[PDB]
Design an enzyme around this catalytic site. Structure first.
Site, PDB file in Angstrom:
ATOM      1  N   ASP A   1      26.790   2.445 -16.047  1.00  0.00           N
ATOM      2  CA  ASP A   1      28.021   2.764 -15.337  1.00  0.00           C
ATOM      3  C   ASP A   1      29.024   3.393 -16.257  1.00  0.00           C
TER       4      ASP A   1
ATOM      5  N   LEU B   1      21.120   2.407 -13.905  1.00  0.00           N
ATOM      6  CA  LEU B   1      21.665   3.386 -14.855  1.00  0.00           C
ATOM      7  C   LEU B   1      23.054   2.968 -15.337  1.00  0.00           C
TER       8      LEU B   1
ATOM      9  N   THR C   1       0.788  -1.213   0.000  1.00  0.00           N
ATOM     10  CA  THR C   1       0.000   0.000   0.000  1.00  0.00           C
ATOM     11  C   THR C   1       0.836   1.287   0.000  1.00  0.00           C
TER      12      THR C   1
ATOM     13  N   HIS D   1      -1.234  -9.255  -0.479  1.00  0.00           N
ATOM     14  CA  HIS D   1      -0.623  -8.682  -1.691  1.00  0.00           C
ATOM     15  C   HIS D   1       0.812  -8.337  -1.312  1.00  0.00           C
TER      16      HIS D   1
ATOM     17  N   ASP E   1      -4.265   0.916  -5.870  1.00  0.00           N
ATOM     18  CA  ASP E   1      -2.846   0.803  -5.607  1.00  0.00           C
ATOM     19  C   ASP E   1      -2.229  -0.591  -5.998  1.00  0.00           C
TER      20      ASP E   1
ATOM     21  N   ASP F   1      -9.505  -3.384   0.084  1.00  0.00           N
ATOM     22  CA  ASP F   1      -8.350  -4.051   0.704  1.00  0.00           C
ATOM     23  C   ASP F   1      -8.716  -4.708   2.044  1.00  0.00           C
TER      24      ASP F   1
ATOM     25  N   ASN G   1       5.899  -1.260   3.522  1.00  0.00           N
ATOM     26  CA  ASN G   1       5.053  -0.841   4.638  1.00  0.00           C
ATOM     27  C   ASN G   1       5.872  -0.822   5.913  1.00  0.00           C
TER      28      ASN G   1
ATOM     29  N   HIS H   1      -8.363  -8.787   2.626  1.00  0.00           N
ATOM     30  CA  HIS H   1      -7.529  -9.453   3.612  1.00  0.00           C
ATOM     31  C   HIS H   1      -8.254 -10.517   4.427  1.00  0.00           C
TER      32      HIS H   1
ATOM     33  N   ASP I   1      22.008   0.869  -9.728  1.00  0.00           N
ATOM     34  CA  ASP I   1      21.118   2.041  -9.681  1.00  0.00           C
ATOM     35  C   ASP I   1      20.162   2.112 -10.904  1.00  0.00           C
TER      36      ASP I   1
HETATM   37  C1  LIG Z   1      14.063   7.590 -11.383  1.00  0.00           C
HETATM   38  O1  LIG Z   1      13.982   9.008 -11.414  1.00  0.00           O
HETATM   39  C2  LIG Z   1      14.724   9.591 -10.364  1.00  0.00           C
HETATM   40  C3  LIG Z   1      14.440  11.099 -10.276  1.00  0.00           C
HETATM   41  O2  LIG Z   1      14.854  11.720 -11.488  1.00  0.00           O
HETATM   42  C4  LIG Z   1      16.199   9.301 -10.595  1.00  0.00           C
HETATM   43  O3  LIG Z   1      16.862   9.604  -9.399  1.00  0.00           O
HETATM   44  C5  LIG Z   1      17.774  10.705  -9.533  1.00  0.00           C
HETATM   45  O4  LIG Z   1      19.020  10.309 -10.088  1.00  0.00           O
HETATM   46  C6  LIG Z   1      20.049  11.294 -10.081  1.00  0.00           C
HETATM   47  C7  LIG Z   1      21.326  10.681 -10.664  1.00  0.00           C
HETATM   48  O5  LIG Z   1      21.643   9.476  -9.983  1.00  0.00           O
HETATM   49  C8  LIG Z   1      20.285  11.869  -8.669  1.00  0.00           C
HETATM   50  O6  LIG Z   1      21.252  12.911  -8.743  1.00  0.00           O
HETATM   51  C9  LIG Z   1      22.165  12.912  -7.615  1.00  0.00           C
HETATM   52  O7  LIG Z   1      21.753  13.862  -6.641  1.00  0.00           O
HETATM   53  C10 LIG Z   1      22.599  14.057  -5.519  1.00  0.00           C
HETATM   54  C11 LIG Z   1      21.969  15.078  -4.575  1.00  0.00           C
HETATM   55  O8  LIG Z   1      20.572  14.980  -4.707  1.00  0.00           O
HETATM   56  C12 LIG Z   1      19.835  15.577  -3.615  1.00  0.00           C
HETATM   57  O9  LIG Z   1      18.829  16.462  -4.096  1.00  0.00           O
HETATM   58  C13 LIG Z   1      17.813  15.829  -4.873  1.00  0.00           C
HETATM   59  C14 LIG Z   1      16.915  16.857  -5.576  1.00  0.00           C
HETATM   60  O10 LIG Z   1      16.143  17.605  -4.652  1.00  0.00           O
HETATM   61  C15 LIG Z   1      17.040  14.859  -3.967  1.00  0.00           C
HETATM   62  O11 LIG Z   1      15.990  14.255  -4.691  1.00  0.00           O
HETATM   63  C16 LIG Z   1      17.983  13.815  -3.338  1.00  0.00           C
HETATM   64  O12 LIG Z   1      17.268  13.013  -2.404  1.00  0.00           O
HETATM   65  C17 LIG Z   1      17.764  11.646  -2.287  1.00  0.00           C
HETATM   66  O13 LIG Z   1      18.320  11.322  -1.016  1.00  0.00           O
HETATM   67  C18 LIG Z   1      17.451  11.329   0.126  1.00  0.00           C
HETATM   68  C19 LIG Z   1      18.060  10.439   1.211  1.00  0.00           C
HETATM   69  O14 LIG Z   1      19.408  10.780   1.422  1.00  0.00           O
HETATM   70  C20 LIG Z   1      16.002  10.844  -0.115  1.00  0.00           C
HETATM   71  O15 LIG Z   1      15.090  11.623   0.636  1.00  0.00           O
HETATM   72  C21 LIG Z   1      15.525  10.811  -1.573  1.00  0.00           C
HETATM   73  O16 LIG Z   1      14.526   9.809  -1.684  1.00  0.00           O
HETATM   74  C22 LIG Z   1      16.677  10.604  -2.573  1.00  0.00           C
HETATM   75  O17 LIG Z   1      17.239   9.310  -2.394  1.00  0.00           O
HETATM   76  C23 LIG Z   1      17.464   8.545  -3.606  1.00  0.00           C
HETATM   77  O18 LIG Z   1      18.520   9.027  -4.452  1.00  0.00           O
HETATM   78  C24 LIG Z   1      19.851   8.985  -3.925  1.00  0.00           C
HETATM   79  C25 LIG Z   1      20.860   9.474  -4.973  1.00  0.00           C
HETATM   80  O19 LIG Z   1      20.987  10.885  -4.951  1.00  0.00           O
HETATM   81  C26 LIG Z   1      20.219   7.579  -3.426  1.00  0.00           C
HETATM   82  O20 LIG Z   1      21.368   7.664  -2.615  1.00  0.00           O
HETATM   83  C27 LIG Z   1      19.105   6.898  -2.621  1.00  0.00           C
HETATM   84  O21 LIG Z   1      19.375   5.526  -2.546  1.00  0.00           O
HETATM   85  C28 LIG Z   1      17.700   7.083  -3.198  1.00  0.00           C
HETATM   86  O22 LIG Z   1      17.494   6.188  -4.276  1.00  0.00           O
HETATM   87  C29 LIG Z   1      19.210  14.500  -2.699  1.00  0.00           C
HETATM   88  O23 LIG Z   1      18.861  15.058  -1.445  1.00  0.00           O
HETATM   89  C30 LIG Z   1      23.960  14.542  -5.999  1.00  0.00           C
HETATM   90  O24 LIG Z   1      24.796  14.730  -4.877  1.00  0.00           O
HETATM   91  C31 LIG Z   1      24.585  13.558  -7.001  1.00  0.00           C
HETATM   92  O25 LIG Z   1      25.754  14.147  -7.557  1.00  0.00           O
HETATM   93  C32 LIG Z   1      26.964  13.364  -7.376  1.00  0.00           C
HETATM   94  O26 LIG Z   1      27.338  12.639  -8.551  1.00  0.00           O
HETATM   95  C33 LIG Z   1      27.714  13.504  -9.625  1.00  0.00           C
HETATM   96  C34 LIG Z   1      27.803  12.796 -10.977  1.00  0.00           C
HETATM   97  O27 LIG Z   1      27.415  13.722 -11.973  1.00  0.00           O
HETATM   98  C35 LIG Z   1      28.994  14.251  -9.244  1.00  0.00           C
HETATM   99  O28 LIG Z   1      29.527  15.005 -10.309  1.00  0.00           O
HETATM  100  C36 LIG Z   1      28.610  15.163  -8.085  1.00  0.00           C
HETATM  101  O29 LIG Z   1      29.717  15.937  -7.691  1.00  0.00           O
HETATM  102  C37 LIG Z   1      28.122  14.285  -6.929  1.00  0.00           C
HETATM  103  O30 LIG Z   1      29.231  13.517  -6.499  1.00  0.00           O
HETATM  104  C38 LIG Z   1      29.617  13.868  -5.155  1.00  0.00           C
HETATM  105  O31 LIG Z   1      29.008  13.022  -4.189  1.00  0.00           O
HETATM  106  C39 LIG Z   1      29.355  11.645  -4.309  1.00  0.00           C
HETATM  107  C40 LIG Z   1      28.484  10.785  -3.381  1.00  0.00           C
HETATM  108  O32 LIG Z   1      28.370  11.338  -2.082  1.00  0.00           O
HETATM  109  C41 LIG Z   1      30.866  11.489  -4.078  1.00  0.00           C
HETATM  110  O33 LIG Z   1      31.283  10.152  -4.245  1.00  0.00           O
HETATM  111  C42 LIG Z   1      31.662  12.374  -5.048  1.00  0.00           C
HETATM  112  O34 LIG Z   1      33.044  12.285  -4.754  1.00  0.00           O
HETATM  113  C43 LIG Z   1      31.148  13.829  -5.041  1.00  0.00           C
HETATM  114  O35 LIG Z   1      31.553  14.530  -3.879  1.00  0.00           O
HETATM  115  C44 LIG Z   1      23.589  13.169  -8.122  1.00  0.00           C
HETATM  116  O36 LIG Z   1      23.529  14.153  -9.139  1.00  0.00           O
HETATM  117  C45 LIG Z   1      18.960  12.360  -8.065  1.00  0.00           C
HETATM  118  O37 LIG Z   1      19.156  12.703  -6.716  1.00  0.00           O
HETATM  119  C46 LIG Z   1      17.913  11.249  -8.109  1.00  0.00           C
HETATM  120  N1  LIG Z   1      16.640  11.714  -7.576  1.00  0.00           N
HETATM  121  C47 LIG Z   1      15.852  11.028  -6.725  1.00  0.00           C
HETATM  122  C48 LIG Z   1      14.574  11.716  -6.277  1.00  0.00           C
HETATM  123  O38 LIG Z   1      16.091   9.892  -6.288  1.00  0.00           O
HETATM  124  C49 LIG Z   1      16.462   7.813 -10.852  1.00  0.00           C
HETATM  125  O39 LIG Z   1      17.778   7.676 -11.351  1.00  0.00           O
HETATM  126  C50 LIG Z   1      15.457   7.191 -11.820  1.00  0.00           C
HETATM  127  N2  LIG Z   1      15.636   5.758 -11.840  1.00  0.00           N
HETATM  128  C51 LIG Z   1      15.877   5.152 -13.024  1.00  0.00           C
HETATM  129  C52 LIG Z   1      16.075   3.658 -13.009  1.00  0.00           C
HETATM  130  O40 LIG Z   1      15.938   5.772 -14.100  1.00  0.00           O
HETATM  131  O1  YA8 Z   2      -4.029   8.608   3.950  1.00  0.00           O
HETATM  132  C1  YA8 Z   2      -3.591   7.706   3.188  1.00  0.00           C
HETATM  133  C2  YA8 Z   2      -2.988   8.066   1.891  1.00  0.00           C
HETATM  134  C3  YA8 Z   2      -1.572   8.137   1.664  1.00  0.00           C
HETATM  135  C4  YA8 Z   2      -1.076   8.507   0.439  1.00  0.00           C
HETATM  136  C5  YA8 Z   2      -1.971   8.827  -0.628  1.00  0.00           C
HETATM  137  C6  YA8 Z   2      -1.511   9.206  -1.904  1.00  0.00           C
HETATM  138  C7  YA8 Z   2      -2.424   9.498  -2.901  1.00  0.00           C
HETATM  139 BR1  YA8 Z   2      -1.837  10.007  -4.646  1.00  0.00          BR
HETATM  140  C8  YA8 Z   2      -3.838   9.426  -2.692  1.00  0.00           C
HETATM  141  C9  YA8 Z   2      -4.297   9.042  -1.459  1.00  0.00           C
HETATM  142  C10 YA8 Z   2      -3.368   8.743  -0.410  1.00  0.00           C
HETATM  143  C11 YA8 Z   2      -3.847   8.384   0.866  1.00  0.00           C
HETATM  144  N1  YA8 Z   2      -3.690   6.386   3.589  1.00  0.00           N
HETATM  145  C12 YA8 Z   2      -4.291   5.948   4.885  1.00  0.00           C
HETATM  146  C13 YA8 Z   2      -3.733   4.550   5.144  1.00  0.00           C
HETATM  147  C14 YA8 Z   2      -3.208   4.071   3.742  1.00  0.00           C
HETATM  148  C15 YA8 Z   2      -3.239   5.234   2.760  1.00  0.00           C
HETATM  149  C16 YA8 Z   2      -1.791   3.937   4.305  1.00  0.00           C
HETATM  150  C17 YA8 Z   2      -1.434   2.483   4.507  1.00  0.00           C
HETATM  151  N2  YA8 Z   2      -1.916   2.190   5.875  1.00  0.00           N
HETATM  152  C18 YA8 Z   2      -2.295   0.951   6.374  1.00  0.00           C
HETATM  153  O2  YA8 Z   2      -2.657   0.977   7.565  1.00  0.00           O
HETATM  154  C19 YA8 Z   2      -2.388  -0.283   5.551  1.00  0.00           C
HETATM  155  C20 YA8 Z   2      -3.456  -0.351   4.585  1.00  0.00           C
HETATM  156  C21 YA8 Z   2      -3.673  -1.465   3.779  1.00  0.00           C
HETATM  157  C22 YA8 Z   2      -2.780  -2.543   3.972  1.00  0.00           C
HETATM  158  N3  YA8 Z   2      -2.708  -3.812   3.349  1.00  0.00           N
HETATM  159  N4  YA8 Z   2      -1.661  -4.476   3.902  1.00  0.00           N
HETATM  160  N5  YA8 Z   2      -1.078  -3.730   4.844  1.00  0.00           N
HETATM  161  C23 YA8 Z   2      -1.743  -2.532   4.899  1.00  0.00           C
HETATM  162  C24 YA8 Z   2      -1.528  -1.388   5.714  1.00  0.00           C
HETATM  163  C25 YA8 Z   2      -1.898   3.424   6.706  1.00  0.00           C
HETATM  164  C26 YA8 Z   2      -2.268   4.499   5.677  1.00  0.00           C
HETATM  165 CA    CA Z   3      24.834   1.983 -12.696  1.00  0.00          CA
HETATM  166 CL    CL Z   4       6.704  -4.786   3.813  1.00  0.00          CL
END
Ligand SMILES: *[C@@H]1O[C@H](CO)[C@@H](O[C@@H]2O[C@H](CO)[C@@H](O[C@@H]3O[C@H](CO[C@H]4O[C@H](CO)[C@@H](O)[C@H](O[C@H]5O[C@H](CO)[C@@H](O)[C@H](O)[C@@H]5O[C@H]5O[C@H](CO)[C@@H](O)[C@H](O)[C@@H]5O)[C@@H]4O)[C@@H](O)[C@H](O[C@H]4O[C@H](CO)[C@@H](O)[C@H](O)[C@@H]4O[C@H]4O[C@H](CO)[C@@H](O)[C@H](O)[C@@H]4O)[C@@H]3O)[C@H](O)[C@H]2NC(C)=O)[C@H](O)[C@H]1NC(C)=O
Ligand code: YA8
Ligand code: CA
Ligand code: CL
Ligand code: NA
Ligand code: NA
Ligand code: ZN
Length: 805
Positions: A691, A689, A159, A420, A308, A261, A180, A265, A687
């Site tokens: 390498d 993507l 979910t 699920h 969902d 849902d 979850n 269940h 990732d």
């Molecule tokens: C699906 O689509 C998504 C969205 O488009 C794709 O994901 C993007 O991919 C980009 C390229 O990989 C990535 O860009 C990187 O961003 C880094 C900073 O980003 C921050 O800001 C963004 C934007 O607001 C934000 O979204 C990020 O948030 C991440 O992290 C927090 C947790 O820490 C989470 O809240 C969030 O969910 C998200 O996590 C996810 O992404 C990160 C990767 O960034 C993963 O670690 C997690 O597992 C998770 O999946 C960030 O807050 C930026 O720093 C990177 O830049 C580095 O690399 C470049 C190469 O060009 C280099 O030149 C730079 O200098 C830098 O390197 C430096 O840091 C290195 C590591 O510390 C170090 O080794 C070096 O020496 C350098 O110092 C990079 O550009 C973008 O963030 C994500 N976006 C999201 C939302 O995930 C995804 O690829 C798609 N998937 C597919 C299959 O296509």
């Molecule tokens: O408020 C929103 C919400 C969140 C994000 C949303 C995003 C969009 Br877009 C639209 C509606 C949304 C509503 N939600 C209330 C409920 C549900 C979504 C979340 C999952 N949940 C459970 O307890 C749960 C439910 C079914 C399950 N099956 N197996 N385990 C399970 C565990 C707590 C939260």
């Molecule tokens: Ca890769």
């Molecule tokens: Cl789970």
């Protein structure tokens, strides 16, 4: 602390979140136990129920009633949804014939059609058909609007991960809600269904639709409802918000139903007790549509009806226990149920080894109902690896089964009959999509698509620029009447070289040999043409793929195939060939068994060499264009060029040889010819993507030949299979895979048997979208066709699933 001494007077379902310790009156205050004292009294009125009756018509406005039937209710925006029907001789929305909505028909002041997202938990795709008799409102939306026969959720089909993918367009691995239930090692914090940590912003990555709207000046209803708020109240609140003044009115709204849902269940997806929840949901849709009609918004609002994930039959007896497999059971932590995630219980336990756990979970029992994986070997189509919250060890559980640690867990925690979370290709996990309104098409059925695509479209329905996400913007343009997003193809970044004959045979010292010095103006003039590209029209049907990063590569033409050869990776990035229905398979002749030939167009310094393969006891080699499908004995020599060679583990060569010798010809026979593009993939950091050169973790011993983590193929033919692949006038049909390049066949429990019993099954598990291959390779395919680019995007998002009807 919440000093709940303030009042909700005038503030019922306020849109701004007020900062603690001020008391709240928002649709989520209950969940934070932070509502003001009078919230129930003022905001959760229930008096008289939810429907007008004959005797309430024209009544005196009693502010205590849940909803109103007084003459003033329409302007107060607060009539019961059936008011005009009971008290004004109007019909229910469901009883009106549908009439195409050719243009939006909105009240003055409406700057855009509003969007209402109506999400239903556990709404399995087959309910649209199987419950259609008891869901008249939903069935009207479905048949009058735009619908898919099903929508593919993301993995895991749980979910939270799916609702947050709907809100963001991202894979769970990227938005961070990967279950979850989660442990984040960096935070050292746990995310649980019960509790307060789940409310902390740090779990929630990406940019949800409501934040996207707000940032771009589009106002949003608050998407989330506390469980206790009844559905009738949720609907009336949306309806009340639609009557707000133009400057205060949101443009996007979400309703959420915990049904079906919840009952699924308890009773299973098709338990007789499931009829009721379906009726009740449909009644709620009817209330919404009746209320929109009263507001004259029923030909103005775009409504999305979306699930969902589905629901499968799962019972207590179908549980596998890790305790029947492992000795060290108490040294691990297992996230259980319809998927398994394993980590060490203590990080101070230096005797924990993931390889021994994996081996004790691998092919241990005849009918074993789960398969262990290191996350990076999971099928790439799942996109489930690139997050620290995803445990290194993962268990893919068979549909209908659970996994648990020890039996006590199951009977000390049968109750449930449905669940699920399984592989998102499983039919029982598929869910629904219906779009209805001015911006959607009229009575249109669209092919199945993935729910990661919806964020873009919802942004398009609202005039928003989507944040970066995993959708392919334009891939769902065929759902829309207007507001289409007109994408352009990415620019090629690297142009190829077209080398001619530049090197003499003796310049090569590769430790390779070939029995080929066995030798005319008929045939010599003709091999010249073939190396210049005379037959390129046959083997490269949709243009060459564009290279979308900076690199040095060569286009290499041959009679039977064309390739883009990377001087950096020393192998092709892609190899393109066409196999007509009439093509014949041949064997590799005896004298040519070990033949590898230098390529006089490509320098020794940019070639592989046979000695590295001799001296690497683990590694052997394969060919991208298969020698088996040579058009003639003379053409076969091209297949043995060192530039067609790629490194392959012998265990993998078993898979690859079967695919090239048997399966390619079988698909050509079945599909009336096929174009095949094959190549390597390098994703050591999992990732999803491509390498770069400096990220390669493994080389053929002694050499700079990088080992792929995967091999792909893209297999294209005519959708109208009466036309041959190479002479197709309309839409294309595609299937693709991304096979893990593994040194053993431990994934395939039947792999000691003949390849005809296990290989194709493995390929099916590793089915892929062309788009997945694009991310993994930095290439852009299908650049030159007669088709529209939107149609091409849709093709690139296609997943061939191999599930029955
Ligand atoms: C699906 O689509 C998504 C969205 O488009 C794709 O994901 C993007 O991919 C980009 C390229 O990989 C990535 O860009 C990187 O961003 C880094 C900073 O980003 C921050 O800001 C963004 C934007 O607001 C934000 O979204 C990020 O948030 C991440 O992290 C927090 C947790 O820490 C989470 O809240 C969030 O969910 C998200 O996590 C996810 O992404 C990160 C990767 O960034 C993963 O670690 C997690 O597992 C998770 O999946 C960030 O807050 C930026 O720093 C990177 O830049 C580095 O690399 C470049 C190469 O060009 C280099 O030149 C730079 O200098 C830098 O390197 C430096 O840091 C290195 C590591 O510390 C170090 O080794 C070096 O020496 C350098 O110092 C990079 O550009 C973008 O963030 C994500 N976006 C999201 C939302 O995930 C995804 O690829 C798609 N998937 C597919 C299959 O296509
Ligand atoms: O408020 C929103 C919400 C969140 C994000 C949303 C995003 C969009 Br877009 C639209 C509606 C949304 C509503 N939600 C209330 C409920 C549900 C979504 C979340 C999952 N949940 C459970 O307890 C749960 C439910 C079914 C399950 N099956 N197996 N385990 C399970 C565990 C707590 C939260
Ligand atoms: Ca890769
Ligand atoms: Cl789970
Ligand atoms: Na070898
Ligand atoms: Na095996
Ligand atoms: Zn559920």
């Amino acid at each position: 602390w919440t000093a709940t001494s303030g009042s909700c007077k005038g503030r019922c379902f306020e849109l701004q979140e007020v900062g603690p310790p001020d008391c709240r009156c928002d649709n989520l205050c209950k969940s934070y136990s932070s509502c003001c004292h009078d919230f129930d009294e003022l905001c959760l009125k229930t008096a008289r129920g939810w429907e007008c009756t004959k005797d309430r018509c024209g009544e005196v406005r009693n502010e205590e009633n849940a909803c109103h039937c007084s003459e003033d209710c329409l302007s107060r925006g607060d009539c019961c949804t059936n008011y005009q029907v009971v008290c004004k001789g109007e019909s229910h929305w469901v009883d009106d014939d549908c009439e195409e909505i050719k243009v939006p028909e909105c009240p003055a002041g409406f700057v855009r059609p509003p969007l209402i997202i109506f999400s239903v938990d556990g709404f399995r795709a087959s309910y649209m058909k199987k419950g259609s008799k008891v869901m008249p409102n939903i069935e009207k939306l479905r048949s009058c609007g735009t619908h898919a026969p099903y929508m593919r959720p993301v993995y895991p089909t749980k979910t939270f991960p799916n609702l947050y993918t709907l809100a963001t367009g991202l894979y769970p691995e990227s938005h961070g809600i990967v279950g979850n239930s989660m442990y984040d090692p960096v935070f050292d914090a746990s995310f649980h269904l019960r509790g307060r940590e789940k409310f902390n912003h740090r779990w929630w990555g990406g940019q949800p639709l409501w934040i996207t709207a707000t940032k771009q000046g589009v106002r949003a209803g608050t998407f989330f409802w506390s469980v206790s708020i009844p559905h009738e109240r949720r609907i009336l609140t949306i309806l009340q918000w639609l009557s707000l003044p133009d400057n205060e009115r949101p443009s996007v709204y979400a309703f959420y139903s915990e049904q079906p849902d919840f009952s699924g269940h308890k009773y299973g997806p098709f338990g007789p007790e499931m009829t009721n929840p379906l009726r009740e949901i449909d009644k709620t849709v009817g209330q919404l549509m009746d209320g929109l009609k009263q507001l004259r918004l029923h030909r103005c609002v775009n409504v999305i009806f979306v699930g969902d994930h589905g629901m499968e039959d799962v019972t207590c007896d179908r549980t596998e226990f890790l305790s029947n497999y492992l000795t060290n059971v108490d040294d691990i932590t297992l996230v259980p149920g319809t998927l398994g995630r394993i980590r060490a219980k203590s990080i101070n336990n230096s005797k924990y080894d993931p390889k021994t756990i994996i081996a004790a979970l691998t092919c241990k029992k005849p009918d074993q109902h789960f398969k262990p994986y290191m996350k990076q070997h999971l099928p790439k189509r799942l996109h489930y690896a690139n997050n620290r919250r995803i445990e290194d060890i993962h268990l893919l559980v068979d549909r209908r089964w659970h996994v648990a640690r020890k039996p006590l867990d199951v009977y000390k925690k049968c109750f449930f009959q449905g669940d699920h979370g399984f592989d998102n290709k499983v039919n029982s996990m598929q869910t629904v999509f219906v779009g209805y309104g001015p911006t959607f098409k009229y009575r249109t059925k669209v092919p199945p698509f993935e729910n990661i695509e919806l964020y873009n479209v919802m942004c398009d329905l609202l005039g928003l620029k989507p944040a970066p996400n995993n959708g392919t913007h334009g891939s769902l343009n065929h759902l829309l009447r207007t507001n289409t997003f007109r994408p352009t193809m990415p620019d090629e970044v690297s142009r190829p070289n077209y080398p001619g004959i530049m090197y003499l045979q003796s310049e090569f010292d590769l430790g390779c040999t070939c029995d080929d010095k066995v030798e005319n103006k008929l045939e010599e003039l003709n091999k010249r043409l073939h190396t210049k590209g005379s037959t390129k029209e046959r083997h490269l049907l949709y243009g060459r793929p564009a290279v979308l990063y900076r690199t040095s590569y060569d286009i290499l033409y041959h009679t039977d195939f064309e390739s883009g050869y990377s001087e950096i990776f020393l192998m092709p990035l892609w190899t393109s060939y066409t196999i007509s229905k009439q093509a014949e398979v041949s064997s590799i002749p005896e004298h040519l068994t070990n033949c590898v030939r230098p390529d006089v167009r490509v320098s020794p310094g940019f070639s592989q060499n046979c000695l590295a393969y001799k001296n690497d006891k683990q590694m052997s080699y394969g060919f991208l264009f298969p020698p088996y499908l040579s058009s003639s004995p003379e053409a076969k020599y091209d297949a043995f060029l060192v530039t067609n060679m790629v490194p392959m583990y012998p265990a993998f060569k078993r898979v690859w040889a079967y695919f090239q010798r048997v399966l390619v010809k079988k698909y050509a026979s079945e599909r009336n010819g096929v174009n095949v593009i094959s190549g390597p993939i390098f994703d050591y950091n999992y990732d999803g993507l491509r390498d770069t050169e400096d990220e390669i973790k493994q080389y053929v011993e002694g050499s700079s030949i990088p080992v792929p983590t995967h091999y792909y193929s893209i297999i294209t033919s005519c959708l109208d299979f009466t036309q041959p692949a190479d002479k197709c006038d309309g839409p294309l049909s595609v299937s693709s895979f991304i096979l893990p390049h593994r040194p053993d066949n431990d994934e395939s429990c039947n792999s000691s048997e003949d390849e005809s019993k296990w290989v194709e099954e493995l390929m099916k598990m590793h089915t892929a979208r062309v788009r997945d291959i694009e991310h993994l390779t930095g290439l852009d395919f299908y650049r030159k066709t007669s088709r529209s680019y939107s149609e091409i995007l849709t093709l690139k998002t296609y997943l061939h699933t191999y599930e029955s009807e």
